[PDB]
Design a protein around this ligand. Structure first.
Ligand code: MG
Ligand code: MG
Ligand code: MG
Ligand code: MG
Ligand code: MG
Ligand code: MG
Ligand code: MG
Ligand code: MG
Ligand code: MG
Ligand code: MG
Ligand code: MG
Ligand code: MG
Ligand code: MG
Ligand code: MG
Ligand code: MG
Ligand code: MG
Lengths: 117, 45, 392, 176, 101, 236, 322
RNA sequence: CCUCCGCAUAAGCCUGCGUCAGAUACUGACAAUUAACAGCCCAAUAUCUACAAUCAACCAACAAGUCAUUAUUACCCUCACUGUCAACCCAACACAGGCAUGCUCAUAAGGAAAGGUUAAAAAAAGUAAAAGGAACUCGGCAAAUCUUACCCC
RNA sequence: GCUACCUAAGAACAGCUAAAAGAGCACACCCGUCUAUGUAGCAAAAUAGUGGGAAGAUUUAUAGGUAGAGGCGACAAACCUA
RNA sequence: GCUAAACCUAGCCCCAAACCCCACCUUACUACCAGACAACCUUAGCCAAACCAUUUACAUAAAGUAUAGGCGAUA
């Protein structure tokens, strides 16, 4: 009889309560006998770096110069990454300079994005 | 003797007044549209 | 009359749009939209197949393209085959002559009181009572529980005779053993893939029961035929099979020689339970299959009269009724309907007890029948013990 | 170790804990991808510690020491996420020309409203997906009247807003 | 990570890796007596116990022996001046038993 | 409604199939026939009314053995599990059909008339005139559709041309191509007609709901109507 | 409502909690043809016996070790019957249930219409030992009743729930494996097979390397306590009629390769608060560290068979009533 | 002194007598229900599956019945997610009503008919009653007893 | 989600007499004969007693179906959210 | 002297001008499996005719004119 309360797995008969989740991404599948097969590749692997020797504390000293915000753009990235090599080889096949015709064949395809975060 | 005609059961609730059932037929689609036009906070049940 | 009504059969796809019929023009479909819209032509999607192999979403190749597909149909007999004609069908399939009653050679092993177990009656009564009443917390244990239990407890009671008979240390009781044996009868390729019950396996073969004179005498006996029922009825016809004679164990396995096939019909439901005749037929076929696998392993895949007949015993049971069988395979030349024929001694419908009362029946507050077995027949357990002791 | 979930023991109980300034987006833009990756976990550990402090302060019914540093950490993490997103977006635009990381399409739903349907990942093609085919992406003629009604409701709301704004402006001018 | 589309995994594909974790957890004082080796956390609702185990073992190098989770229902009984129910957020609670005693 | 007929099985089998009662309701959910509903749950036994159905890879007349004669909940007449070659099948048992009997099914129309033996299936042209038949087919190979109830027996009257005249149990005459098959003798359970229900509960068990309580006036149709027997129904 | 105690439990340090629930003190240690037969069973279940269906690791336990342990028990019973006459008449049970229901401690109802009322802490153990031997003559006490051992029973400072342990309300069963009418009422040995969820490899992956012995020990304590208590209550003793003689039992718990041996002596059914207020008795469980029967099986050969482990099994089977 | 009950599961509800502080079984804050129980399943293509249940044994049936695989091909390499609280739900209510199942068959569990006083009428429930015993009344309604025979439908 | 009927697959029916019973007495359970109270009531149909059935045409939990020019009905113009 | 009494702006009415991250059709707000199923078809009635039955409305001027109409209500 309650319509304004959110629909959660805590409401409904046993089948409903079992079937609905809470947003947790699936980790595997179910086989005969309701046995859960967990796939390792489906478990997110936290790629935590080595923080030893890292010099960047969470906060920044207040005695730090203030600089104008310059959001990175495609043009800026091209100028700072590709333009030098392009100029050199023009003075002296874009794959050599860096362009990749197709995202297929890459582990990290930019579009459609296939990596987390 | 009367008064307790509502014997709650979420299965019947959702199978009778649910979003899927309302969208199943054009009449229910228009019901949802009427609720949306009126501004109801609860379009379906 | 065709089975399956139209309303249940798969719906026919809707008629194609006339735009497709029109030759020179390319139809405009909602394929580019990636979803259905009722005002555009329905696309003709090319057949799709996932590029990679995916178990749990795998479709087998069509039957004819299976590597083992064969035009010649092999008729397989498995644990859940219920022959229509029963014992006659089994005898015809195995080229076997039936002898009512167990052989004197085995029956005499229990005549001497020394082989007799101490307190046979009391021990067997205790076994029955444990299997049928005391087994589980349930008030009335089901057959699926008290059939395997009764068989195992009887086997343990027999095994207790290791004191008297040290030779009983050369036998084991293997479970989940499966054997396979193929042979031809009247140009019919018949296979037996026997699984299920327990296999008592010895380190030594069983002695032959019948003498060569009796084996020759089997020539005159003629297989009882049955018309119009074919001998193949109730056997799984299979066009995708592998003709292989497998004894169920890798070469060099200790305890290789089958000594008993303990088959149990533990289905709770009567229809799901074999009839006594069908169970005896299953016993015949499994004993023949095990013996034939042994013969093929030993003397090779040659159709010939065995110079050393192979003996296999079997005990079929339903928890209350038992059937005892001793099968002597003395020929692998099965194709021909004439010649020396294998022979099986059978004792049928030997009921260990007439009935068991799990609760005391009370009439007018008077106990008419006490809890426990009624009509106990120690002769059946004597036959059981004789079979177990045979070869020791 | 679990000690990383709590502030320094010397800091425990201190009424105020002095903290630096939150990382700025411009400052972060100078840092390498590996440096940002490490700083993300540094800030994550700090954020976990500060959230633990907040919850424990609520449990003890006491004010959280220096509550502003939690906001500073959240701002720093947001700036780092924005910088990484900017770099990823620039690279995606350069290599593919797509301005959205997730495929999608403008589609008309069953209610006649134009939505940006964001595509989901499937193993079978759409023409075979049963649930997708159940989902409807077209509005039948009976929805046009409700589309008009919603349009007119929006127009009425907008007209009321504008007329009220003009009334208020005129009252202000008369008052001053 | 949360509020992000997980790249669909097909059989034989690469391992799913998350570089900048989005899950932030709280170490909370238990409200009831707990075993000495048990730690209580409040977790994002989208985090599995496997995710929490890897999170703790990778970011904090905490040897985790066992993890259990439960979804605590936040009260919806409270009402504002407009008689509209105020929903206390539901939250996931994780009990983590440390390893090596 | 979502009514889907339970008659979806496509492969013939001997196993009792799990039926689903209708209660007289059409697929739309509305009552189409009154007085049907409830009763003991039943399982359907697929009857092979095409008695001459030579087994796959086989042809010509063949014999079969009657394993047993069994009560059928779905039929007034009892059935028989008849097995031949390497197949079994349910058929409609005739009056004096016992287990172990041999039943012949032939397609041969000999010049003379076959010696009719109860239970066997022969083309109508092969039967002597005046024999009692049952499970008659409208067309050659269509399958038995007439004279299938308990104790019902049609009569073979005439064999003019390549046709046969059959007196149906309702006494109507029927012309069928003589190639169509029909079993000899009368259907089993001949005493079904003399079955006393005894109690309204037994009707409810059988699945017949009570008649409507509304009172109906009897019109002109009610009176006893004596009519000439209808003309022959031809299928040639 | 009662806590369902699982002998084979994934709960960490469950052995100490079970010791508390049982008033049990754990003590390290204990109070040729056979080798050929054991190797024959191992090779029969690993190499010789042809399998029609491919065997998956998740069912390897059930389809390999369980038949292997059954074969070991049966064949060893047959072979040692000459040297142990009582073992001849014993009853061998496969996966027969063993139920024990008891009360241990009290609790104040925390919430609800019954808040503040004292309620007993009921426990039920429902075990299914893979094999077990039941006799009609009780075994001899391993140590005299009232055996004072300095070791102190572990104490639980929190609720039993915190150890993953959940309450239910179902039939309270006290069952030794056969009904009370069965003459073979005393216990001789229980052969337990650990389930796949408790694999040594899985524990090592889960960082529970310390918990292998804990799993074995908890399974032993729970199962043997349930069995001995069921035997005692079949004999008529209970909390207010505490046992007048020790009730002894033995167990071997195996993962398929590693075996551990346990001896349990029930000296106390007075576990309730009322009967335990001034009870000096306490049950005892002797246990041994898990040892591998064999190192590896390569095709037709078993490498490094442990004659000492085989002799431990043989000695347990050779134990006889006095 | 009462015990209709009670304890659990299901269904339903959704934090709804746990701690602290304020008020005057309320408000605010804090905490909590941890999976083994239960839900959440199953690779294809063919191919099997006559013989109820009822202690299943006799008997006895009719209304004719909940329970079964094989053949080949694929496939292990990996214990997630969700319910778990309460004095509770449907009846506008702390409603004498409705409410499936397992055990307890009177309980070990759960509860309090009397706010205090007096002991008027009338009213309700109950108990007892001299002699009589339907004379009451439309009628033996009610109550008390255990009680024959004849008629309509 | 009440109710009329139906569909799927479930569940309940102590004890006694009799014997395979739309059998008898009688719990649970279903119903509601008669009386009293109540009549803005505990209750928009209840309570107490009394009473009919209680192994069947029985009762009942779950999900589904039939929709108003209609449905369903052992016809009471019944019932289809007081 | 208590209940209380009042209050001015929250907004609204009529016109003009001007055209207006993730989840979610399965039990919606549910990461992740072979679909096939697809929309279009006269408004009626109240009411008036004092009933009702044909019938009864849905820039200016020509003009309420020509016409229609149980030639009447009215159109
Ligand atoms: Mg209801
Ligand atoms: Mg009538
Ligand atoms: Mg859980
Ligand atoms: Mg009171
Ligand atoms: Mg008073
Ligand atoms: Mg008187
Ligand atoms: Mg009078
Ligand atoms: Mg009188
Ligand atoms: Mg008078
Ligand atoms: Mg009276
Ligand atoms: Mg009864
Ligand atoms: Mg009756
Ligand atoms: Mg009438
Ligand atoms: Mg009337
Ligand atoms: Mg009018
Ligand atoms: Mg008027």
């Amino acid at each position: 009889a309650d319509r304004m309360s959110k629909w959660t797995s805590k409401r409904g008969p046993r089948s409903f309560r079992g079937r609905k989740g809470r947003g947790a991404k699936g980790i595997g599948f179910l086989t005969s006998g309701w046995r859960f097969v967990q796939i390792k590749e489906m478990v997110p692997e936290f790629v935590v770096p080595d923080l030893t020797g890292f010099k960047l504390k969470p906060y920044v000293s207040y005695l730090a110069p203030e600089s104008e915000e310059t959001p990175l753009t495609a043009a800026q990235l091209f100028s700072e990454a590709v333009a030098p090599a392009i100029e050199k080889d023009f003075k002296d096949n874009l794959e050599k300079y860096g362009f990749e015709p197709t995202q297929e064949g890459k582990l990290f395809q930019l579009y459609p994005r296939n990596f987390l975060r | 003797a009367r008064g307790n005609e509502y014997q709650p059961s979420n299965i019947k609730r959702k199978n009778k007044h649910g979003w899927v059932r309302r969208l199943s037929t054009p009449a229910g689609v228009q019901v949802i549209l009427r609720r949306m036009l009126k501004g109801r906070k609860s379009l379906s049940h | 009359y065709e089975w399956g009504v139209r309303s249940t059969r798969k719906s026919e796809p809707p008629p194609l749009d006339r735009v497709y019929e029109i030759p020179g023009l390319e139809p405009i479909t909602f394929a580019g939209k990636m979803h259905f819209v009722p005002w555009l032509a329905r696309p003709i999607f090319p057949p799709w197949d996932r590029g990679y192999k995916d178990p749990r979403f795998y479709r087998s190749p069509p039957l004819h393209e299976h590597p083992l597909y064969k035009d010649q149909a092999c008729y397989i007999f498995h644990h859940r085959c219920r022959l229509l004609e029963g014992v006659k069908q089994a005898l015809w399939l195995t080229k076997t002559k039936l002898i009512e009653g167990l052989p004197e050679k085995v029956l005499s092993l229990v005549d001497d009181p020394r082989n007799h177990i101490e307190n046979q009656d009391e021990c067997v009564l205790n076994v029955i009572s444990h299997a049928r009443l005391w087994q589980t917390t349930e008030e009335i244990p089901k057959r699926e529980t008290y059939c395997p239990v009764i068989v195992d407890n009887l086997i343990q009671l027999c095994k207790s005779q290791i004191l008297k008979h040290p030779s009983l240390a050369r036998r084991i009781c293997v479970q989940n053993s499966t054997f396979s044996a193929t042979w031809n009868r009247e140009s019919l390729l018949l296979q037996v893939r026997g699984s299920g019950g327990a296999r008592l396996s010895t380190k030594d073969p069983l002695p032959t029961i019948a003498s060569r004179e009796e084996i020759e005498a089997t020539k005159n006996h003629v297989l009882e035929t049955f018309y119009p029922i074919s001998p193949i009825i109730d056997l799984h016809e299979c066009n995708i099979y592998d003709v292989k004679n497998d004894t169920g164990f890798q070469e060099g396995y200790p305890y290789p020689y089958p000594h008993t096939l303990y088959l149990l019909d533990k289905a709770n439901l009567r229809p799901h339970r074999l009839q006594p005749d069908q169970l005896r037929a299953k016993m015949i076929l499994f004993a023949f299959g095990s013996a034939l696998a042994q013969a093929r392993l030993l003397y090779g895949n040659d159709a010939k009269v065995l110079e050393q007949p192979v003996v296999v015993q079997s005990v079929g049971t339903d928890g209350r009724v038992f059937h005892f069988l001793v099968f002597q395979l003395n020929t692998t030349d099965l194709d021909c309907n004439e010649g020396v024929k294998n022979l099986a001694w059978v004792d049928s419908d030997q009921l260990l007890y007439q009935h068991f009362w799990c609760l005391p029946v009370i009439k007018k507050r008077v106990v008419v029948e006490p809890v426990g077995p009624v009509g106990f027949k120690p002769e059946t357990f004597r036959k059981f013990l004789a079979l177990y002791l045979h070869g020791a | 170790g679990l000690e990383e979930f709590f502030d320094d023991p010397k800091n425990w109980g201190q009424e105020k804990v002095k903290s630096g300034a939150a990382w700025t987006c411009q400052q972060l833009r100078n840092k390498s991808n590996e440096d940002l990756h490490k700083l993300w976990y540094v800030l994550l550990k700090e954020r976990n510690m500060l959230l633990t402090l907040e919850q424990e302060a609520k449990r003890q019914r006491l004010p959280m020491p220096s509550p502003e540093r939690l906001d500073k950490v959240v701002d720093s993490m947001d700036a780092l996420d924005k910088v990484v997103q900017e770099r990823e977006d620039a690279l995606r635009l350069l290599q593919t020309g797509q301005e959205r990381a997730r495929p999608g399409a403008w589609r008309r739903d069953i209610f006649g409203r134009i939505i940006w349907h964001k595509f989901k990942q499937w193993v079978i093609p759409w023409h075979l997906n049963k649930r997708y085919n159940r989902k409807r992406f077209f509005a039948l003629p009976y929805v046009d009247h409700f589309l008009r009604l919603e349009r007119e409701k929006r127009a009425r709301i907008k007209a009321r807003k504008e007329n009220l704004e003009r009334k208020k402006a005129k009252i202000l001018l008369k008052k001053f | 990570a949360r509020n992000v589309v997980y790249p669909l995994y097909r059989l034989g594909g690469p391992q799913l890796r998350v570089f900048r974790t989005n899950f932030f957890i709280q170490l909370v004082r238990p409200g009831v007596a707990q075993p000495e080796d048990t730690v209580q956390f409040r977790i994002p609702m989208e985090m599995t116990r496997v995710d929490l185990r890897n999170y703790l073992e990778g970011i904090y190098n905490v040897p985790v022996a066992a993890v259990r989770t439960r979804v605590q229902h936040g009260s919806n009984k409270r009402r504002d001046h407009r008689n509209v129910r105020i929903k206390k957020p539901d939250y996931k609670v994780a009990y983590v038993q440390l390893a090596h005693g | 409604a979502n009514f889907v007929s339970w008659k979806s099985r496509t492969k013939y089998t001997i196993t009792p199939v799990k039926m689903r009662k209708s209660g007289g309701r059409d697929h739309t959910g509305r009552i189409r026939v009154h007085g049907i509903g409830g009763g003991h749950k039943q399982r359907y036994r697929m009857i092979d009314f095409l008695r001459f159905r030579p087994e796959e890879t086989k042809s010509g007349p063949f014999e079969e053995k009657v394993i047993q004669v069994r009560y059928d909940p779905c039929r007034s007449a009892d059935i028989a599990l008849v097995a031949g070659g390497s197949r079994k099948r349910w058929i409609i048992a005739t009056e004096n059909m016992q287990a172990g009997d041999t039943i012949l099914n032939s397609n041969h129309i000999g010049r003379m008339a076959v010696a009719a033996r109860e239970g066997d299936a022969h083309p109508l042209g092969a039967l002597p005139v005046g024999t009692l038949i049952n499970n008659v087919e409208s067309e050659p190979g269509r399958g038995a559709q007439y004279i299938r109830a308990a104790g019902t027996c049609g009569v073979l009257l005439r064999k003019v041309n390549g046709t046969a005249i059959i007196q149906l149990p309702s006494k109507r005459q029927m012309q069928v191509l003589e190639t169509c098959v029909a079993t000899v003798g009368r259907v089993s359970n001949v005493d079904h007609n003399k079955r006393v229900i005894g109690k309204a509960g037994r009707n409810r068990w059988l699945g017949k709901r009570p008649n409507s309580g509304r009172w109906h006036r009897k019109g002109g149709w009610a009176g006893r109507k004596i009519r000439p027997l209808p003309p022959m129904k031809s299928y040639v | 409502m009662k806590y369902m105690v699982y002998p084979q439990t994934f709960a960490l340090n469950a052995d100490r909690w079970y010791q508390y629930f049982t008033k049990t003190v754990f003590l390290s240690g204990l109070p040729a043809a056979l080798r050929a037969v054991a190797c024959d069973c191992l090779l029969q279940e690993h190499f010789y016996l042809r399998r029609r269906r491919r065997v998956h690791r998740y069912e390897e336990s059930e389809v390999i070790s369980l038949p292997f342990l059954d074969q070991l028990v049966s064949t060893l019973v047959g072979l040692l019957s000459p040297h142990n006459p009582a073992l001849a008449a014993a009853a061998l049970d496969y996966r027969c249930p063993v139920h024990f229901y008891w009360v241990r401690g009290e609790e104040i109802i925390p919430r609800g219409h019954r808040r503040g009322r004292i309620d007993d802490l009921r426990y039920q153990i429902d075990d299914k030992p893979n094999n077990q031997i039941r006799i009609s003559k009780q075994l001899a006490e391993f140590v005299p009743l009232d055996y004072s051992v300095p070791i102190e029973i572990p104490t639980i400072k929190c609720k039993p729930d915190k150890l993953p342990l959940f309450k239910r309300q179902y039939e309270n069963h006290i069952f030794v494996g056969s009904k009370t009418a069965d003459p073979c009422c005393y216990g001789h040995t229980q052969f337990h097979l650990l389930p796949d969820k408790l694999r040594r490899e899985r524990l090592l992956r889960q960082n529970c390397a310390d918990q292998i012995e804990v799993v074995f020990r908890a399974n032993a304590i729970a199962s043997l306590f349930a069995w001995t208590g069921a035997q005692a209550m079949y004999q008529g003793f209970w909390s207010e009629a505490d046992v007048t003689r020790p009730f002894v039992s033995q167990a071997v718990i195996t993962d398929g390769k590693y075996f551990s041996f346990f001896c349990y002596q029930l000296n106390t059914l007075a576990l309730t608060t009322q009967a335990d207020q001034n009870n000096p008795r306490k049950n005892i469980c002797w246990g041994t560290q898990s040892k591998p029967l064999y190192e590896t099986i390569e095709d037709n050969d078993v490498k490094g068979f442990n004659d000492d482990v085989l002799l431990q099994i043989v000695h347990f089977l050779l134990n006889r009533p006095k």
